[PDB]
Amino acid sequence: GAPATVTEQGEDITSKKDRGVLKIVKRVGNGEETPMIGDKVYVHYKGKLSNGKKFDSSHDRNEPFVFSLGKGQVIKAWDIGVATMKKGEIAHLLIKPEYAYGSAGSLPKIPSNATLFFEIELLDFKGE
Ligand SMILES: COc1cc2cc(OC)c1OC/C=C/CCOC(=O)[C@@H]1CCCCN1C(=O)[C@H]2C1CCCCC1
């Protein structure tokens, strides 16, 4: 499956090189520029737990997901992961708990020590 592949071919994009956030580019975007911290960022995404019990998509709310990069509004994996993406790119991220909800989880949405998978499309990122 898509997350297996990420375990197998995915680039470790953490600083500590702990495999906490692995990435594969699925569709190549346009341009050299990636989002800077503080940029307003627009994405579509699909997300699930590796336990396979919960799924979630932006598409369902019929609205892009908008957040400010680096401003602590998403999990660290997103701040790290979306910083690496170009306008128009689609990527897969596999994420260990330390870059997600950790040992405490976010009960009951996210259980203790959960691993997460996302497919993310970077639509646009504007400067603050
Ligand atoms: C749409 O509602 C949610 C989705 C997720 C988690 C939620 O909170 C536990 C949540 O409710 C409100 C919180 C939003 C920001 C935190 O969320 C994140 O930082 C990440 C990245 C941004 C998109 C959503 N995402 C999530 O972690 C999802 C989660 C949903 C369960 C399956 C795995 C992904």
Curated annotation (Swiss-Prot):
Domain of life: Eukaryota
Positions of the PPIase FKBP-type domain: 30-118
Organism, scientific name: Homo sapiens
Impact noted for substituting K16Q: Mimics acetylation; impaired interaction with AKT1 and PHLPP1
Function, as annotated: Immunophilin protein with PPIase and co-chaperone activities. Component of unligated steroid receptors heterocomplexes through interaction with heat-shock protein 90 (HSP90). Plays a role in the intracellular trafficking of heterooligomeric forms of steroid hormone receptors maintaining the complex into the cytoplasm when unliganded. Acts as a regulator of Akt/AKT1 activity by promoting the interaction between Akt/AKT1 and PHLPP1, thereby enhancing dephosphorylation and subsequent activation of Akt/AKT1.
Tissue: Widely expressed, enriched in testis compared to other tissues.
Compartments, as annotated in UniProt: Cytoplasm; Nucleus
Induction: By androgen.
Gene that specifies this protein: FKBP5
Subunit structure: Part of a heteromultimeric cytoplasmic complex with HSP90AA1, HSPA1A/HSPA1B and steroid receptors. Upon ligand binding dissociates from the complex and FKBP4 takes its place. Interacts with functionally mature heterooligomeric progesterone receptor complexes along with HSP90 and TEBP. Interacts with NR3C1. Interacts with Akt/AKT1 and PHLPP1; enhancing dephosphorylation and subsequent activation of Akt/AKT1. Interacts with IFI44L; this interaction modulates the kinase activity of IKBKB and IKBKE. Interacts with IKBKB and IKBKE.
Protein name in the entry: Peptidyl-prolyl cis-trans isomerase FKBP5
Impact upon substituting K16R: Decreased acetylation; promotes interaction with AKT1 and PHLPP1
Full-length numbering of the shown residues: 16 to 140 of 457
N6-acetyllysine, modified sites: K16
PTM comment text: Acetylation impairs ability to promote interaction between Akt/AKT1 and PHLPP1. Deacetylation by SIRT7 promotes interaction between Akt/AKT1 and PHLPP1, leading to suppress Akt/AKT1 activation.
